[PDB]
DNA sequence: TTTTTTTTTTTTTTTTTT
């Protein structure tokens, strides 16, 4: 629902322009905005803020809904194809749009390769698990290689010229720059149809920008705002969010039940924000192991997938 | 329909006042 | 890049730039990439002034989005430093990539230092033969830098030995604090002349003994992460190629046996995620060595054989075959 | 070097200097190379005082950059002590190199200690004949030091036997802690008289028994790293050559069959990475022995033949041929 | 054009307030001593 | 020209509080 | 009331056949 539909009952273009400059680009963003934030920006009074919230609630649902209708709506969710049948069956169809999906594991386990694969499969038609939408790639490590996209695009039949022309790439140099890029992302997604958001990675910059134990409170609080912004992007536009994460070795040997001496970075802020978490491990040669650590509905399981020149796919008999 | 290049160009203009046709990404020591 | 002197606009005085230079920021890119919190610790920098600095810097340095087509065009113009070996050049897809960190790890006498010495010469030869037409900066922490090797290698590529030795800045680090401090001095040098390569050899040698025991492990890892982040910023600011070598340790806990290699590199997860490309070196027969790509975002996991000769790293010869 | 008394500038008094000396710092270079953490551990030293010392030391000792052309000229004037054999010197390209650590490993009776006895005399002869014109310091961890060998060797080189014996300092280590603590006393004698060689024979003799089982393996290797780091600092401050011997053990596993040598040095990866030049020793026919260059930053892999006589290490004779 | 040596001089001057013409690297024992 | 013998004497008491002239070094059983 | 981090490290030979 466009934000311009609020041009009724005394709200003029001047107020909407102020809302646009404050980071609100859709009617949903106004509706979900707490009353405190509306009063923070200048040019809007208490009467205007109450009018905006009442008008926004008229175009955006806020009431109750039966579980039967909600189940019917979620059965029409678009699941982006991952390119591998093993992962597609494991996740019940693949990466689900409108929710946060997190990937963590040791290096060379294929987290970035999957993100490159999804960046191409989000443009193929819906009949083959696509999204028919553009992609947005925010890279905080400087490891975005467009040469991978061309090789993958040929496999799926896409024109390499168009595949590179439908992907937007940005690099974040600091935590403040990383958060501000989402504000620019909101404007872009409000003009053209997007279907995927990729952050690679999340904790790469927060690890170094905030140094010491005294800044742990600030570090975790800034991270909470980033995930809140990411969830708002999925709510307003429905685009899938895929974020990657590193791992850290637990030096404390007090517990030994877990065979993995490595745990994801982020703490409970990361663990509670992510709807779905996947753990990656290295197998034989090109093979890798993916395990669903946490998910509200998918059972805990495991599968095997392989990294190939054309992207991520099921392991072949040659590897077997 | 707007091309992605022009859509990106306007977004950079309205957020940084940067002429995207003159200020470009560079990745390393170029051959030119 | 963008000179820092271009920011003297809209009330920015001489002292403002001088204070920034003393704080380690020497390019308009550096101030643009610096977080707002970091700019606040400089004395004489106010709340309003810091915001003005960020806005002006962002006007000269791109911060927005770009189409993957345009970034692909720019990456196709990237200069790759030749390694002197055709087999190794093909393995890396052209040579050592500029604007990214390459990590070499392995056992001893595996040729890590020999490769770095060869790159110190190949960074000065013209572009058409795989060079970069620049100078080299060689930061050393173990005391194993020999200008004698550069004399032999420079003769192979047609370079004058005196000129080759006059375009390589050398500096030795003696502790972790000195190792990080040398980077600020490098940035000032790099802003006044064209550099194309910087070498740290090796990284974890000093960190192993400066931090002792499990009680100082957390402090050691965080100090290392600060050093690696500073190295990455140099690549973004100036576009040069960073080469860092690493040592190896033999794992003792035989709980896992899937990996035939019982040796792993020093650094933990901080070093593993920081490096863009990692190469593993092993000894073959005689003067031959084995190289294998371990981690790379755009290179398949392959293996190639290269040999070390008195004129530098080269392809294996039929005499050894 | 630069005496530590020259730091008596800008609020530095006897008490500040005396506290530093008791902590193991005896030269200006020792203060400069020391990290900030170590200086803060010394009682009576404040953060303001510690930072002042670093600034003063940096202005006195070279802590900055240099061109590789100048470093080449500096290394061309380096003193190399002859080993008593023309074949050994030619293979080493001059002899044992001062300012670096040289490691000798092999079986028993191969000739590791005999070479060290020869080096203990060649370090006193004048520079014109490959000497060092300085005293030697010998640390023995096995009780195998024999001054009788020095007397016969000194007669060959024409030195006065009384003067030869009076210019060598001998100490014996009984445990790993005692061995490391001997280095602190060694440093003090360095600052008061001219020495030219450090010999440790052997390094891993006491580490093998003082640490038992895989439980103490981590502690054993960490202690060894500190010992080798201290040896490196001695070479940096004073320029004395460091020669260390080592023992070998058999390779029970036959997987590494591609290496004809079934024995490897003791010390793990820390010992291998710390040494600058490694030399292997094997027994030849009769009194002849074989020496091989295993790892070296600038020396190609090659072998040579030397012999052991009454008057020390020398070239093999045609009579033995 | 300014040589690299010259460029080394000012940088050492700026950071360490030291004259590189007075202090130089010494890598061991020199024959000239 | 501090003889090595005297220099060693100073070092021992500095580090060990031992009179070197009284506490000598023994290699084993001696005929004395 | 708030709110986690982070890996190290190799040992060491046996034993004639007719
Ligand atoms: N073109 C290619 N063909 C085949 N395999 C490839 C190709 N490019 C990369 N790989 C494989 O992918 C690996 C890199 O994995 P990936 O880039 O996804 O890392 P990651 O899990 O995101 O880790 P990190 O960011 O911590 O380094 C390489 O080590 C290699 O095995
Ligand atoms: N002039 C030369 N000619 C031929 N080969 C040489 C020459 N100099 C060195 N080498 C070879 O290179 C080896 C040294 O390798 P190098 O010092 O580069 O290894 P490294 O991995 O850096 O070692 P370290 O762990 O000690 O730092 C020698 O053992 C020898 O085989
Ligand atoms: N006076 C001498 N005259 C001739 N040869 C001698 C003399 N003394 C010793 N040797 C030779 O030197 C050998 C001892 O070598 P050396 O003491 O250097 O061995 P090493 O490698 O240090 O061994 P270890 O492991 O026992 O310490 C003897 O076996 C003998 O061959
Ligand atoms: Mg990655
Ligand atoms: Mg090396
Ligand atoms: Mg011996």
For D68-131, the DSSP string reads HHHHHHHHHTB-EE--S-HHHHHHHTSSEETTSEEEEEESTTSSHHHHHHHHHHHTTS-GGGT-
Tell me the angle at which helices C112-122 and C147-156 cross, rounded to the nearest 10 degrees: 60
Q: State the Cα–Cα distance between residues A266 and A277, nearest whole angstrom.
A: 13
> What Rg, from alpha-carbon coordinates, does chain D have?
21
Which residues of chain B does C127 touch, with a Cβ-Cβ cutoff of 8 Å?
Answer: 31
Report, in this order, helix, strand and coil percent for chain B, each rounded to 5.
40, 5, 55
Task: Please tell me the distance from the alpha carbon of residue C27 to that of residue C30, in angstroms, as a whole number.
Answer: 5
Q: How many helices (H) and strands (E) does chain E have?
A: 1, 0
CB C171 within 8 A of CB D66: yes
| Alpha-carbon span C111 to C109, nearest angstrom | 6
β-strand C303-309 against C312-314: which pairing, if any? antiparallel
Distance in angstroms (rounded) separating the CA atoms of residues D137 and D124: 12
For residue A93, count other CB atoms closer than 10 A to its CB. 15
**Is residue E26 classed as helix, strand or coil in its secondary structure?**
coil
Cα separation, C121 vs C283, in Å, equals 24
Query: Using CA of residue C190, residue C193, residue C195, residue C201, what is the dihedral sign?
Result: negative
Going by C-alpha positions, the residue among C238, C242, C213 that lies closest to residue C228 is: C242
CB contact under 8 A, E7 and C185: no
Query: Other C-beta atoms within 10 Å of D130: how many?
Result: 18
Rounded to the nearest 10 degrees, the angle between the axes of helix C14-22 and helix C47-60 is 80
List the beta bridge partners of residue A70: none
Which tokens sit at A84?
Answer: 């591998």
Torsion of CA D254, D259, D263, D268, to 10 degrees: -90
Mapped onto helix, strand or coil, the DSSP state of residue D273 is: helix
Task: Give Cα A104 distance to the centre of its chain.
Answer: 14
Distance from CA of C35 to the nearest CA of A (A): 6
Query: Please, which positions of strand G sit below 7 A from a protein CB?
Result: 2-14
C61: CB partners within 8 A, 6+ apart: B23, C2, C28, C29, C32, C33
Running DSSP on this structure, what letter comes out for residue F21?
T
| Atom number, ligand 3, closest to the C-alpha of residue D117 | 18
- Residue C229 tokens read as 């982040």
Maximum C-alpha span of chain D: 70
Q: Enter the tokens of residue C297.
A: 């975002």
Q: Bin C287: left if φ > 0, else alpha if -120 < ψ < 50, else beta.
A: alpha
Is the separation of the CB atoms in D80 and D98 below 8 Å? yes
Q: C295 to chain A: which residues are within 8 Å by CB?
A: 107-108
Question: Which ligand lies nearest the alpha carbon of D297?
Answer: 2
Chain A 13..32 CB hits on strand G (< 7 A): none
Chain E, nearest residue to C187 by Cα: E11
Query: Which of E20, E23, E26 is facing D239, going by the closest CB pair?
Result: E26
Q: From ligand 3's centre to the CA of C30, what distance in Å?
A: 63
Neighbours of A78 (CB within 10 A): 21
Does a cis peptide bond (omega within 30 degrees of 0) precede residue A201?
yes
List the beta bridge partners of residue D243.
D102, D199
DSSP one-letter string for C93-143: TSSEETTSEEEEEESTTSSHHHHHHHHHHHTTS-GGGT--SSEEEEEESSS
Of D138, C170, D69, C229, residue with least CA distance to A204: C229
- Which 8-state DSSP code applies to residue D3? B
Token look-up 């970069």 returns C132
| Paired strand residues for A264 | A247
Tell me, what DSSP letter sits at residue C216? G
DSSP conformational letter for A141: S
Distance separating alpha carbons of residues A103 and A114, to the nearest angstrom: 10
The answer to the question of whether D113 is labelled as a binding residue is yes
Residue (of D65, D294, E7, D239) closest to C140 by Cα position: D65
Other CB atoms within 10 A of residue D83 CB? 24
- Token output for A69: 């209708």
Query: Nearest nucleotide (C1') to the CA of residue D267?
Result: G10
Q: Which residues contact A127 (CB under 8 A, 6 or more apart)?
A: none
| C41 min Cα distance to partner chain E (Å) | 20
Number of Cβ within 10 Å of residue D243's Cβ equals 26
Distances D277 to C118, C283, D295 between C-alpha atoms, Å: 20, 17, 6
The helix (H) or strand (E) run that includes residue C76 is helix C68-76
Element (H, E) at D289: strand D288-295
Q: Environment class of residue A9 by beta-carbon count within 10 Å: exposed (0-12), middle (13-18) or buried (19+)?
A: exposed
Looking at residue A316, what DSSP letter applies? P
Q: In what order do the strands lie in the sheet with C101-106?
A: C312-314, C303-309, C288-295, C277-283, C101-106, C241-246, C195-201, C135-140, C168-172, D66-67
- In the 175-234 segment of chain D, residues within 7 Å (Cβ) of strand G are 208, 214, 217-218, 221-222, 225
Q: Tokens representing D9? A: 């500038």
The dihedral over CA atoms of D280, D286, D287, D292, expressed in degrees to the nearest 10, equals -20
Residue B25 near residue C66 (C-beta atoms within 8 A) = yes
Whose structure tokens read 């060990």? F16
Question: In this structure, which residue's CA is closest to atom 10 in ligand 3?
Answer: D308
D148 CB less than 6 Å from ligand 3? no
The rounded distance, in Å, linking the Cα atoms of A313 and A306 is 5
Which stretches does DSSP call E strand in chain A? 79-80, 95-96, 100-105, 134-139, 167-171, 194-200, 240-245, 247-249, 262-264, 276-282, 287-294, 302-308, 311-313
Dihedral angle sign, alpha carbons of residues D156, D158, D162, D164: negative
- Give the chains touching C; criterion: ≥3 Cβ pairs < 8 Å: A, B, D, E
Ligand 1 centre distance from Cα of residue C92 (Å): 14
What distance in Å separates the CA atoms of residue A14 and residue A189, rounded to the nearest whole number? 22
**Smallest Cα distance from E11 to chain C, Å:** 7
What is the distance between the alpha carbons of residues C166 and C161, in angstroms, rounded to a whole number?
A: 9
Q: Which residues of C are annotated as a binding site for ATP?
A: 106-113
With an 8 Å Cβ cutoff, are E4 and D98 in contact? Answer: no
D266: tokens are 């003791």
């Amino acid at each position: 629902v466009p934000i311009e539909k609020l041009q009724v009952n005394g709200i003029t273009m001047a107020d909407v322009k102020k809302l646009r400059e404050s980071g609100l680009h859709t009617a949903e963003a106004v509706a979900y905005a707490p009353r405190k934030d509306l009063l923070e920006i200048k040019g809007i009074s208490e009467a205007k803020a109450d009018k905006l919230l009442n008008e926004a609630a008229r175009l955006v649902p806020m009431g109750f809904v039966t579980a039967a209708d909600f189940h019917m709506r979620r059965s029409e969710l678009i699941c982006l194809t991952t390119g591998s049948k093993n992962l597609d069956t494991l996740l019940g169809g693949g990466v689900e749009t409108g929710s946060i999906t997190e990937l963590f594991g040791e290096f060379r386990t294929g987290k970035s390769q999957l993100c490159h694969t999804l960046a191409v499969t989000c443009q193929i038609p819906l009949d083959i698990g696509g999204g028919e939408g553009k992609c947005l790639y925010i890279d905080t490590e400087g490891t975005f290689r467009p040469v991978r996209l061309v090789s993958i695009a040929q496999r799926f039949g896409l024109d390499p010229d168009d595949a590179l022309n439908n992907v937007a790439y940005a690099r974040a140099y600091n935590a403040d720059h990383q958060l501000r890029l989402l504000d620019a992302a909101a404007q872009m997604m409000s003009e053209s149809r997007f279907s995927l958001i990729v952050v690679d990675s999340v904790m790469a910059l927060y690890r170094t920008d905030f140094s010491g134990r005294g800044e742990l409170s600030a570090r975790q609080m800034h991270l909470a705002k980033f995930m809140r912004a990411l969830q708002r992007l999925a709510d307003q536009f429905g685009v899938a969010v895929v974020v990657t994460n590193q791992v850290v070795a637990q030096v404390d040997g007090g517990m030994a039940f877990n065979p993995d001496p490595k745990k994801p970075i982020g703490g409970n802020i990361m663990a509670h924000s992510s709807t779905t978490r996947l753990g990656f491990k290295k197998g034989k040669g090109c093979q890798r192991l993916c395990k669903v650590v946490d998910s509200p509905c998918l059972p805990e399981a495991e599968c095997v997938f392989a990294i190939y020149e054309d992207g991520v796919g099921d392991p072949r008999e040659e590897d077997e | 329909k707007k091309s992605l290049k022009d859509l990106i160009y306007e977004t950079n203009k309205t957020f940084y006042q940067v002429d995207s046709n003159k200020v470009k990404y560079k990745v390393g020591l170029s051959k030119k």
